[PDB]
Copies of this chain bind each other. A is one copy, B any other.
Amino acid sequence: QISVRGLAGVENVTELKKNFNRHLHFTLVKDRNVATPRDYYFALAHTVRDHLVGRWIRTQQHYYEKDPKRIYYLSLEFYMGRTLQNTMVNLALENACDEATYQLGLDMEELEEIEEDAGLGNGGLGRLAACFLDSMATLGLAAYGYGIRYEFGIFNQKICGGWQMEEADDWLRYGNPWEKARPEFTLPVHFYGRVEHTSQGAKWVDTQVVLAMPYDTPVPGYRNNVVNTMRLWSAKAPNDFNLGYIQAVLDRNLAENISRVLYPNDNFFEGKELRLKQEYFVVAATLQDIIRRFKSSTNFDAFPDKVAIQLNDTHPSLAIPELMRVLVDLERLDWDKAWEVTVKTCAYTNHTVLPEALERWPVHLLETLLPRHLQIIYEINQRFLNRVAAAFPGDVDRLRRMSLVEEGAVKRINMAHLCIAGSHAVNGVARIHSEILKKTIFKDFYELEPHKFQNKTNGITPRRWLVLCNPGLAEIIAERIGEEYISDLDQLRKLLSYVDDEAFIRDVAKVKQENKLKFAAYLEREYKVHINPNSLFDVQVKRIHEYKRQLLNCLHVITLYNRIKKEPNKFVVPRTVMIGGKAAPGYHMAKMIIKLITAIGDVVNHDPVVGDRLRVIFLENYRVSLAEKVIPAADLSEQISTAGTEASGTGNMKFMLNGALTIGTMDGANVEMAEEAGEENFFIFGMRVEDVDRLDQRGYNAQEYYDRIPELRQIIEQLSSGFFSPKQPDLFKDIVNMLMHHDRFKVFADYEEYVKCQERVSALYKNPREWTRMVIRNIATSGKFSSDRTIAQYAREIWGVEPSRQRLPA
């Protein structure tokens, strides 16, 4: 049908049909009389997987023979989403499978919808890990992702009575055809116990053992025949575990609970023992696998020449003291040599400055669970502080601020300080964030070791986030500039030559229109909701958090409602305002925000005076597969965090690639996006970081804004008095109280500029030709935000390896 989806050759189609029927009969044990759509999905998935196998085996043999430096990306989250379509895209099989299935009487798009998301992450951090794997494979790097195979991923969100309810995400119920269990590379992981000091060093004894069993998933590069591996560990009890009899077998559950469920926090730390066990489990199993692979090529001088370990935040920070433990206690290296190897091997990426998100583990927990690691941490700390004291003699307060050990009520280990001390490179995730790290929270570290600190601005994969989710747009671009841009996104700059081309303008606007119709139809089918597809699609999708300021969007929505009610017969640009995202289960204020959004919808959507001029829709169960549907359909991307809080953002980038304009603050990567497109082509508003600092010095007084802005005061009075909750008039009083007295994120301070800037959006939308020209200028300058660019920078500036676009043979 369309060119970027590849060739449907007669031979290839005939073979795909034959293999589909083979898997239906032999693998699934069904005939066509009794097969359901789910059986058809599995038959297709097995058929496509068969095409990965030879390449997977060949890629791994190639790494064994060439022995390149290997890159190990360690993360507690990999937010993969669905695999079927992505695999077909990367192997150039999409049109062939469409034709084969069409010839068998089946619709491939309906089969794709059956697959479960692999939801092994919370949001941006986990999704970044997934983009990165895709880019590493596309760039020919010998890379492995290592994590945990959670039995239950991020919860499924249902909305009941306008409230979030959580359901378990039993993603493995029907089987996962993409993974291969590897019970033969099972490894032991130790917990608890005590330390004995012999004449021949320290020994960690009397430990409890849990087994780590690996499951491997293929990660195909884009049309280069490289298939890398994601290795996820699952927890198993040993067979002599607890070994009256029946209870001992049932208690195997205690050990296997380590890999049971993903902690559903985003930007929020809690010191729970189970989470610490998860973190050590992944590190201990991973490092053993790494060492085994290194020895099969005790000269550890060469270890950093053959191995890089990238820490995705502090969540796998125990890799530092575990590497030391192995080298000192088991391999018998002297401390100083071990430390040299460790620092040269490890690098740390920081993803947040919010203080409540930073991991600070109580010492008593580490003492019980990981007594040897605590000894090693103290020794790292004493040696590190000895260096600080030599460089800044007499600066006793600096010694307290830089310590890995925080004093107090409960002594804690600051894991971020541990990661900086033990890594040769430390990076933030957007230019403004990296600068903030050097000026504020890690200023002391930067002064001691300035060479360590870098920036690596985030990116997204253009395979999933353009070709897969928006083939119509990919196609109209390819018609003009060819297909090379899919793996070299900077080539999108060539589209600036088409900003005045009437045909290109028309085709861009047509693609958006088709995507909006398709999305409006999806909403009627699966959720019984009617929307005007000629309205401006105003979209804010991301996790629910005070810092992301869904509440600021709420206040705009109410403003627009109130203005319609005041002058009902005046024209206004119609909007469909869509907000979606999950709240962490124990985060009360986030749950109240969801309820506010649905309550505003209840009033607005049923007011006959409003008509179809304004609709407010809460999009339930926001996840990767839903992002692939709504992002292509958006007109306006809402990126409105308080300046200084969103370390990067990556949703922002996905919207820019797919032909939405952005309204946003100068925060995170929004800064760089505006720089690349031109500020004239972005809707920028609100306090800059320096303005937030100035208000903090004077003291933020929300009352002042209430007193001076009548439109704002009317909204607060409506919230307080029960206008949006007529049966429970005090329902929203905690939201009102927070906004008026303890708002850390200064929602009222950006309200006036936000409303004014939204009026400019509406004005431009009235002129479709000019809106579309601005869109072209955004898509054309989105190339910097390819994760291929990001990964090339990590490779050259941190890992010491050279990317390659060279194909392996098929």
Contacts and interface: CB of A to CB of B under 8 A. Distances in A.
**A interface, by DSSP: helix, strand, loop or mixed?**
mixed
Interface in A239-276: 239-241, 243-246, 248-250, 252-253, 257, 260-261, 263-264, 272, 274
Contact of A175 (B165, B181, B263, B272): B181
B243 A168 contact: yes
A86 to B, nearest CB: 19
Contacts of A57: 25, 29-31
- Interface size of A as a range: 35 or more
A250 B253 CA distance: 9
Contacts of A237: 168
Given A246-B274, A260-B250, A184 B152 contact: no
Given A168-B252, A174-B183, A239-B170, A244 B585 contact: yes
Interface in A35-59: 36, 38, 50, 53-54, 56-57
A387 interface: no
A528 B155 CA distance: 54
Interface in A42-82: 50, 53-54, 56-57, 61
A586 B245 contact: yes
Given A181-B175, A184-B38, A263 B240 contact: no
B250 A261 contact: yes
A57 B25 CA distance: 9
B31 A244 contact: no
A57 B175 CA distance: 22
A245 B165 CA distance: 10
Contacts of A56: 29
B585 A245 contact: yes
A152 B249 contact: yes
Interface in A565-602: 585-586
Interface string A209-250: 000000000000000000000000000110111011110111
A231 B246 CA distance: 24
B38 A26 contact: no
A155 to B, nearest CB: 7
A152 to B, nearest CB: 5
Nearest to A263: B246
A280 to B, nearest CB: 18
B166 A243 contact: yes
Interface string A176-194: 0000110110000000000
A57 B61 CA distance: 39
Contacts of A260: 249-250
Contacts of A38: 184
A167 interface: yes
Nearest to A170: B239
B246 A250 contact: no
A483 to B, nearest CB: 30
A170 B256 CA distance: 14
A490 to B, nearest CB: 36
B244 A261 contact: no
Interface string A528-563: 000000000000000000000000000000000000
Interface string A755-783: 00000000000000000000000000000
Contacts of A53: 25-26, 29
A181 B585 CA distance: 33
A259 to B, nearest CB: 11
A167 B243 CA distance: 7
Contact of A257 (B26, B36, B250, B272): B250
A240 B167 contact: yes
Contact of A168 (B180, B239, B244, B274): B239
A175 B25 CA distance: 20
A173 interface: yes
Contacts of A586: 244-245
Contacts of A272: 246
Nearest to A52: B29
Interface string A350-365: 0000000000000000
B184 A36 contact: yes
Interface in A146-175: 152, 155-156, 165-168, 170, 173-175
A257 to B, nearest CB: 6
A278 to B, nearest CB: 11
Nearest to A60: B34
A184 B155 CA distance: 22
* Residue among A156, A165, A175, A253 with the highest chain B CB neighbour number at 10 A: A253
Interface string A590-625: 000000000000000000000000000000000000
A698 B516 CA distance: 96
Nearest to A183: B174
Nearest to A58: B31
A183 B39 CA distance: 11
A338 to B, nearest CB: 32
Given A57-B31, A250-B261, A239 B167 contact: yes
Interface string A783-803: 000000000000000000000
Nearest to A175: B181
17 contacts: A25-B53, A25-B57, A29-B56, A152-B249, A168-B237, A168-B243, A170-B239, A174-B183, A175-B181, A244-B585, A244-B586, A245-B264, A245-B585, A246-B272, A246-B274, A250-B260, A250-B261
Interface of A: 25-26, 29-31, 36, 38, 50, 53-54, 56-57, 61, 152, 155-156, 165-168, 170, 173-175, 180-181, 183-184, 236-237, 239-241, 243-246, 248-250, 252-253, 257, 260-261, 263-264, 272, 274, 585-586
Given A25-B57, A170-B239, A245-B585, 15 more contacts: A29-B56, A29-B57, A30-B57, A36-B184, A38-B184, A152-B249, A155-B245, A156-B239, A166-B243, A167-B240, A168-B252, A175-B181, A245-B586, A246-B263, A246-B274
